[PDB]
Amino acid sequence: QIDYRDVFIEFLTTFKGNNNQNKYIERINELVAYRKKSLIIEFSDVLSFNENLAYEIINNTKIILPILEGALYDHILQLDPTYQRDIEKVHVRIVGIPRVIELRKIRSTDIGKLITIDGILVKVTPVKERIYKATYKHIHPDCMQEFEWPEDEEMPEVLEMPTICPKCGKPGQFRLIPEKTKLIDWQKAVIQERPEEVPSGQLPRQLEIILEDDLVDSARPGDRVKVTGILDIKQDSPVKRGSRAVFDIYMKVSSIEVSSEEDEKKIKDLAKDPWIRDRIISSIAPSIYGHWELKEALALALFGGVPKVLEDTRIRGDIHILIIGDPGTAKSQMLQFISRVAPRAVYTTGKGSTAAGLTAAVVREKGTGEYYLEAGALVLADGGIAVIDEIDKMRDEDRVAIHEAMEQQTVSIAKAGIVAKLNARAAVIAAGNPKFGRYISERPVSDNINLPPTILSRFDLIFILKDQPGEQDRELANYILDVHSGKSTKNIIDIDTLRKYIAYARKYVTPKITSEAKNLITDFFVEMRKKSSETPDSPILITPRQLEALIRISEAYAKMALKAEVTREDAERAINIMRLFLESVGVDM
Amino acid sequence: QIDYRDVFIEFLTTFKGNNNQNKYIERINELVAYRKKSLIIEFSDVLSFNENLAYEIINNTKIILPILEGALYDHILQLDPTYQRDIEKVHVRIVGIPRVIELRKIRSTDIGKLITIDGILVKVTPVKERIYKATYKHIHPDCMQEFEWPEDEEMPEVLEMPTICPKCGKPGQFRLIPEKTKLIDWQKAVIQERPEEVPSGQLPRQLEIILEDDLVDSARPGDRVKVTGILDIKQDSPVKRGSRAVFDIYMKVSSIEVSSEEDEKKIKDLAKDPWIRDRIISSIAPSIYGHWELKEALALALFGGVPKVLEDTRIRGDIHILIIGDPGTAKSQMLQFISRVAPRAVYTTGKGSTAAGLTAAVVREKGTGEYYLEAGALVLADGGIAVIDEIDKMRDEDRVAIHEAMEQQTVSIAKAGIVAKLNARAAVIAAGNPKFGRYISERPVSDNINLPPTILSRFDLIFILKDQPGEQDRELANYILDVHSGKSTKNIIDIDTLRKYIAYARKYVTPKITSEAKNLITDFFVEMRKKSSETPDSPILITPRQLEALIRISEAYAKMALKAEVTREDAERAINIMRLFLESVGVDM
DNA sequence: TTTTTTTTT
Ligand SMILES: [Mg+2]
Ligand SMILES: [Mg+2]
Ligand SMILES: [Zn+2]
Ligand SMILES: [Zn+2]
């Protein structure tokens, strides 16, 4: 009685956006340029434009969605006749559905309607192909006829062959022809509920989702997604009777989003502040009093340096931080905060991790008994940050397994006839206690740290934390009580804004070293070697790795302000911060 | 529709190459003489000759390849009728398809089209036979009739059996006749995407390819290959239902490449320069400052000596290098460069390797329940170079498993009722750290190395690296910053040219030892042994292996300049580099 | 059972 085809077309071409620019017109034009085949529509925009259509989509999705897709194809076809013979149909995906249901609250009444689920991806299968319109040939000396079996109907998820030949009305043997068969991409993924939603005592539950067409390979394991689709029951062998009338639940995903223009201007406005570096540093772990030098160092690791890829070798651009401190110095507190503000981070512990789990594991699947590779903690953290708490408690024979990944950023496995190399370009932040629990001033620094010199040289910065009860006890006590009383600090950038700022900086900023910065870095490195050679007693070594640490830190400081060149000011800060690092380990420069 | 037989024949007989030598005419003559039954055609040559013909091959590949093959067969048969009765049919393989698609980005729209994928070979199955035209026999008291079941059609991939006997129009059961059955060679291989195209935080994907006819055994595992063919879906168990309407994809290989006259000309003129040895040495790891003695030693291992095979025993011709140094001395960077410039190299680490994974692994095939052998890292590196980083970090029980492979170049396995002996003719390059991380000058050499004398004697050269800060820090710092600034050293042979030069030398050069070099080597070996007895406390021993090392090094120097004999000059260089090895380890000369 | 990599008494 009522047709929404004109309404949908009117909404797409007449919708004044936030800036009154008809954003959906631009989105359509962007789709035509690269043949995206998929259009994303905000549910709120549909509700704002015409409410009546909004309930039709959310309640009658299985019928109205194909109608809208056909209307969209005609409009695009008129705009660009050449859109044919490369894309045969388009997809309309809806996001922002208010029907959000927890993974553990799914019941029978929720099956058959469009719902949204928030969770964590844990497993992705390789992309495969699914038949939705097959072609068969009747193997009978009379027929030799070709036909499509699922006539006037999309082929069901359960394969079925015809029993009577449509063109001859006879049974027999039918042969499938892959050449005339129509296929669609098919991928299976497993989603898991967030730890914040898991109830006390029980383990988290999992749900199976299916991605098809261009939705395949839209996310990687470990990501946080918001999948929207229709729930349905899953069957494997319906022909195989013998009870077992109980079925699982799987979701047919229609739209997926992971974790905008308005963010860019907000980010750009922040970088215009001359004191942006101080604001960022003061925004790291606002609940922790003091430790300004530690907060500044942790900010550098979040941004990192510029990796160099050459025709013969490649240079690591990540920054590694090591912290040694007495118990109660809150070392585990900023580590938790770092794992929260970083766009991608993995949190591990020295005791709860092994060498195989840190880098890669070779396991035998019982399905075939064939060995295959399993990604480790450092591999899954590629492009992000790996946090290793209580590193001193880790077994030494297991700790040496990360020496290659800390510098060469690769993992090499030669086990059971498997030879492979995996990228592990991740920043490593580690914390631990001294040899005797607390730091002892009488003993030398060498036996207090209790770490081999090989792993110490791989850390760009090393800070030693000492809990000395002094005058600042009253200041610290008042700060802690204020936190427990609900009092908070203002003019601190929020985590969500800070996380967006870091991600933008790591993607569009690549500082370059200037001549002025080169001279300052070169002079200071020479001063290190002369001082180190004078006293061959410190447990740390001034290797050429330290020179490259200066370069990486200088780039991080420039990247913190979204600068394109490493000026003298950034070089001075890089020199200054390492002076504190050398002072902590007892080297007086 | 215009016939392409005349154009194809005209193209073959009239195409002019770089020298207008009618290259494809020569290929046909080579094909006739050797009965190669296969022709390789470069796509760009076809496009230059006739663009319309090139387009037809790309798109109408299914129906035009047999047409061109038939025309070529008649031309060859006319050229030499003796070619018939020896070769039933020929194959036309097209190389140089502009359509290249990554392994991970294969979609449904690419099925049924000629595409090219470049990857790494992993697994190769033994050659088997496939039926493409069966011959059954309807046994029944009245029939006694035999027939070719697939009439006017090639036998499908699925083994199908006739239901009604064509000769009598009656049902029953049929018996296959192997004698009259036509067969074709069949092989299954697995290809993997290159590590440089795998997305961050994800494991590499795999694709299944099928090789038939002369394409079998065209490559070995670990090779980089470029395959062109048609993608198709894979059917495994279609007899039983149970849904599973999702299918994997495999590739029907049409042409395969691995990894010329012009290149040989370029190599020949390079050796004409009297300072070719210095140019090659200076081109090893251009991003590393200093370490000239290590650069020279690494170049020698790339070329190696001349293996000797006698009627009663064989002598290895590979050079083994061991490097011990303080952390940060760029030991790993040189090893990474070696693994990239060598024609065939395998990179492993001490911690990520096992005894089974390095030599050979015995694995039980779950399909049949019987044990079988899997090639280790050393076996896969036969005829190449094996790199073992962090040699001191592996357990001594596992490190001792390579004693036989490092000297006898064989691997002996007596496990699970399997007795075998596999060739492991590979050069071993190892690096490691001293016992206490950094070298201690006050302590002797015996406790610093912390390696058994047995494995030490198997290394041709051993170099000890010490990181002593001094007057060279400023020049070292300037060199590193220039690398980070994008500046590159000129007058350096590129990796691609250097790799070609090494491969040619290892294949066509076999130097001989003259009388002048014989006397020099004998005198030095006697003098070296005499000084060894003076100080028997050194962990290194002057075994007769060191005499063989001098011969191998002398041959490598001659092979570096493409010489035919080991002159007096090459003997001096071998002695000079040996003196540095002895001096570095603590033995004066 | 027997060979292998892995976490676990
Ligand atoms: Mg803690
Ligand atoms: Mg190293
Ligand atoms: Zn029929
Ligand atoms: Zn019959």
Tab-separated table of C-alpha atoms in Angstrom, chain A residues 124-131 137 139 141 156-161 173 175-176 178-179 183-187 216-217 219-221 235-239 308 310-315 355 366-371 373-375 379-380 382-383 397 400-401 403-404 408 410 412-417 419 421-423 425 453-454 457-458 513 518 521-523 525-526 529 532-533 541-545 547-548 551, chain B residues 62 104 106-108 111 123 149 153 156 160-161 163-164 195 198-205 232-233 235 238-249 285-287 327-329 332-333 336-337 339-340 346-349 351-354 356-358 361 363-367 372 374-377 380 389-390 393 433 436-438 467-470 473-474 476-478 480-485 487-488 495:
chain	number	residue	atom	x	y	z
A	124	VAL	CA	38.826	-16.418	11.719
A	125	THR	CA	38.728	-19.152	9.074
A	126	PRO	CA	40.219	-18.798	5.580
A	127	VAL	CA	37.945	-17.356	2.911
A	128	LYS	CA	35.981	-20.007	1.018
A	129	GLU	CA	33.184	-20.200	-1.570
A	130	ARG	CA	29.526	-21.153	-1.109
A	131	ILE	CA	27.176	-22.273	-3.879
A	137	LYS	CA	23.606	-32.131	-16.049
A	139	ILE	CA	23.777	-38.307	-16.786
A	141	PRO	CA	21.880	-41.476	-22.432
A	156	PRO	CA	19.860	-23.498	0.849
A	157	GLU	CA	22.900	-23.883	3.074
A	158	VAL	CA	22.382	-27.670	2.889
A	159	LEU	CA	23.458	-29.156	-0.433
A	160	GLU	CA	20.722	-31.092	-2.223
A	161	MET	CA	20.659	-32.757	-5.635
A	173	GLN	CA	22.515	-39.530	-11.949
A	175	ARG	CA	26.674	-34.142	-12.473
A	176	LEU	CA	27.583	-30.693	-11.149
A	178	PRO	CA	31.547	-25.748	-11.661
A	179	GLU	CA	31.898	-23.585	-14.782
A	183	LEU	CA	29.489	-18.774	-6.014
A	184	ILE	CA	29.666	-16.307	-3.129
A	185	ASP	CA	32.485	-15.691	-0.663
A	186	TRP	CA	32.061	-17.353	2.723
A	187	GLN	CA	34.000	-16.921	5.967
A	216	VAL	CA	35.109	-11.255	4.572
A	217	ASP	CA	38.496	-10.307	6.057
A	219	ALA	CA	38.664	-7.709	10.962
A	220	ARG	CA	41.498	-9.588	12.649
A	221	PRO	CA	41.528	-11.727	15.814
A	235	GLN	CA	22.508	-27.875	11.411
A	236	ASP	CA	25.173	-30.263	10.127
A	237	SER	CA	23.516	-33.569	9.116
A	238	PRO	CA	19.726	-33.092	9.060
A	239	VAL	CA	19.316	-36.347	7.118
A	308	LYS	CA	63.299	2.235	8.149
A	310	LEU	CA	65.880	-0.456	3.024
A	311	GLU	CA	66.727	-2.522	-0.038
A	312	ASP	CA	69.147	-4.669	1.999
A	313	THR	CA	68.147	-4.425	5.685
A	314	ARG	CA	65.455	-2.930	7.901
A	315	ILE	CA	65.745	-0.884	11.094
A	355	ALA	CA	58.581	-19.274	25.539
A	366	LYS	CA	43.962	-34.256	16.325
A	367	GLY	CA	41.840	-33.991	13.176
A	368	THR	CA	44.776	-34.876	10.917
A	369	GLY	CA	47.802	-35.278	13.201
A	370	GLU	CA	49.712	-32.675	11.175
A	371	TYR	CA	51.790	-29.994	12.877
A	373	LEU	CA	51.879	-22.948	13.591
A	374	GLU	CA	50.022	-21.059	16.319
A	375	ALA	CA	50.476	-17.328	16.833
A	379	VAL	CA	53.028	-12.138	16.938
A	380	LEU	CA	49.478	-11.131	17.880
A	382	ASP	CA	52.482	-6.971	15.836
A	383	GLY	CA	51.979	-3.277	15.162
A	397	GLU	CA	65.806	-20.192	29.790
A	400	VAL	CA	66.041	-15.606	26.039
A	401	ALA	CA	63.402	-16.632	23.481
A	403	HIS	CA	65.927	-11.692	22.173
A	404	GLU	CA	65.409	-12.029	18.416
A	408	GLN	CA	65.104	-8.147	14.557
A	410	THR	CA	60.960	-11.600	13.678
A	412	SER	CA	61.991	-18.076	13.466
A	413	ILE	CA	60.738	-21.623	14.064
A	414	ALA	CA	62.452	-24.845	12.946
A	415	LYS	CA	60.523	-27.699	14.561
A	416	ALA	CA	59.009	-30.956	13.278
A	417	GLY	CA	59.679	-30.137	9.642
A	419	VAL	CA	60.419	-23.678	8.851
A	421	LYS	CA	59.381	-16.624	9.832
A	422	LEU	CA	56.754	-14.367	11.406
A	423	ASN	CA	56.779	-10.606	11.904
A	425	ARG	CA	57.104	-5.678	15.185
A	453	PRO	CA	73.816	-7.634	29.734
A	454	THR	CA	72.458	-8.976	26.432
A	457	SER	CA	71.191	-3.468	25.840
A	458	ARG	CA	67.925	-4.134	23.976
A	513	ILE	CA	66.181	14.125	11.021
A	518	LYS	CA	72.455	15.194	13.888
A	521	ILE	CA	73.005	13.428	18.828
A	522	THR	CA	76.500	12.643	17.526
A	523	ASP	CA	78.237	14.707	20.212
A	525	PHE	CA	76.814	9.589	21.858
A	526	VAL	CA	80.582	10.148	21.838
A	529	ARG	CA	81.349	6.029	25.109
A	532	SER	CA	81.528	4.283	29.827
A	533	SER	CA	85.100	3.343	28.893
A	541	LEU	CA	76.786	-1.211	28.087
A	542	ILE	CA	76.903	1.726	25.673
A	543	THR	CA	76.491	-0.138	22.386
A	544	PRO	CA	75.523	1.289	18.980
A	545	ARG	CA	71.948	0.389	19.964
A	547	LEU	CA	72.830	5.710	19.420
A	548	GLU	CA	69.733	4.499	17.569
A	551	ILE	CA	67.180	8.729	17.005
B	62	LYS	CA	39.481	-22.337	-22.443
B	104	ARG	CA	44.869	-13.408	0.213
B	106	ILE	CA	41.246	-13.999	-4.296
B	107	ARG	CA	37.469	-13.644	-4.618
B	108	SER	CA	34.607	-15.285	-6.497
B	111	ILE	CA	37.238	-18.084	-10.673
B	123	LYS	CA	54.811	-29.405	0.000
B	149	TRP	CA	32.653	-44.615	-20.756
B	153	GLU	CA	34.036	-35.680	-23.222
B	156	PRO	CA	35.610	-35.475	-14.900
B	160	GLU	CA	31.842	-41.711	-12.162
B	161	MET	CA	30.692	-45.144	-13.313
B	163	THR	CA	24.715	-47.060	-15.080
B	164	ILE	CA	23.292	-48.267	-18.420
B	195	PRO	CA	56.258	-13.223	4.241
B	198	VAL	CA	51.243	-11.181	5.074
B	199	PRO	CA	49.104	-8.670	7.016
B	200	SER	CA	50.240	-7.695	10.488
B	201	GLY	CA	49.329	-10.105	13.265
B	202	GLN	CA	48.114	-12.873	10.947
B	203	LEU	CA	49.453	-16.254	9.890
B	204	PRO	CA	50.208	-16.851	6.195
B	205	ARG	CA	47.580	-18.469	3.996
B	232	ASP	CA	38.431	-23.931	-9.604
B	233	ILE	CA	36.493	-25.315	-6.653
B	235	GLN	CA	35.305	-31.555	-4.461
B	238	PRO	CA	30.225	-35.376	-2.730
B	239	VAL	CA	28.625	-38.828	-2.390
B	240	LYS	CA	27.285	-38.278	1.142
B	241	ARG	CA	25.065	-35.319	2.023
B	242	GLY	CA	25.248	-33.282	5.215
B	243	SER	CA	25.212	-29.716	3.870
B	244	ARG	CA	28.897	-28.720	3.527
B	245	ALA	CA	27.870	-26.552	0.548
B	246	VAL	CA	31.054	-24.534	1.147
B	247	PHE	CA	33.989	-25.494	-1.077
B	248	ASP	CA	37.688	-24.696	-1.116
B	249	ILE	CA	39.504	-23.489	-4.233
B	285	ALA	CA	76.242	-5.520	4.046
B	286	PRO	CA	76.646	-1.918	2.811
B	287	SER	CA	74.720	-0.622	5.846
B	327	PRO	CA	75.980	-7.503	22.125
B	328	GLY	CA	75.320	-4.680	19.693
B	329	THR	CA	78.177	-5.531	17.306
B	332	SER	CA	72.647	-10.441	13.294
B	333	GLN	CA	72.450	-7.703	10.648
B	336	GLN	CA	70.168	-11.261	7.710
B	337	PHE	CA	71.903	-9.831	4.638
B	339	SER	CA	70.115	-14.943	3.963
B	340	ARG	CA	68.823	-12.410	1.405
B	346	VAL	CA	67.608	-20.921	5.420
B	347	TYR	CA	67.511	-18.730	8.535
B	348	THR	CA	67.146	-20.348	11.966
B	349	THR	CA	67.787	-19.385	15.584
B	351	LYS	CA	66.288	-21.025	20.777
B	352	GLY	CA	63.612	-21.611	18.134
B	353	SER	CA	65.164	-24.785	16.723
B	354	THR	CA	65.207	-28.432	17.783
B	356	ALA	CA	64.458	-32.988	14.890
B	357	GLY	CA	63.649	-29.710	13.139
B	358	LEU	CA	67.241	-29.098	12.045
B	361	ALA	CA	61.693	-35.456	11.828
B	363	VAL	CA	56.121	-38.191	11.893
B	364	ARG	CA	53.261	-40.695	11.917
B	365	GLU	CA	50.808	-40.244	9.045
B	366	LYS	CA	47.415	-40.377	10.763
B	367	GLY	CA	45.718	-41.379	7.504
B	372	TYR	CA	57.649	-41.289	7.374
B	374	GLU	CA	60.213	-34.963	7.005
B	375	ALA	CA	63.091	-32.832	5.761
B	376	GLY	CA	64.839	-30.655	8.328
B	377	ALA	CA	66.380	-27.224	7.959
B	380	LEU	CA	66.161	-28.188	2.827
B	389	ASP	CA	71.753	-17.293	14.932
B	390	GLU	CA	72.373	-17.481	18.692
B	393	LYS	CA	71.505	-20.400	23.331
B	433	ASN	CA	77.766	-14.363	22.481
B	436	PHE	CA	79.282	-13.832	30.279
B	437	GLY	CA	77.425	-11.853	27.610
B	438	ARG	CA	80.427	-9.617	26.960
B	467	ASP	CA	83.115	-3.665	21.335
B	468	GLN	CA	85.820	-1.292	22.566
B	469	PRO	CA	84.849	2.407	22.512
B	470	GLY	CA	87.572	4.621	21.102
B	473	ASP	CA	83.044	6.361	17.564
B	474	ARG	CA	82.572	9.628	15.658
B	476	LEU	CA	80.690	5.164	13.289
B	477	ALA	CA	78.029	7.598	14.517
B	478	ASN	CA	78.121	9.612	11.284
B	480	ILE	CA	74.697	5.268	11.106
B	481	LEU	CA	72.930	8.636	10.904
B	482	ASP	CA	73.532	8.799	7.144
B	483	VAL	CA	71.791	5.430	6.777
B	484	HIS	CA	68.810	6.728	8.756
B	485	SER	CA	68.817	9.894	6.614
B	487	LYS	CA	71.955	8.408	2.069
B	488	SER	CA	73.349	5.321	0.341
B	495	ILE	CA	71.760	-7.603	-4.474
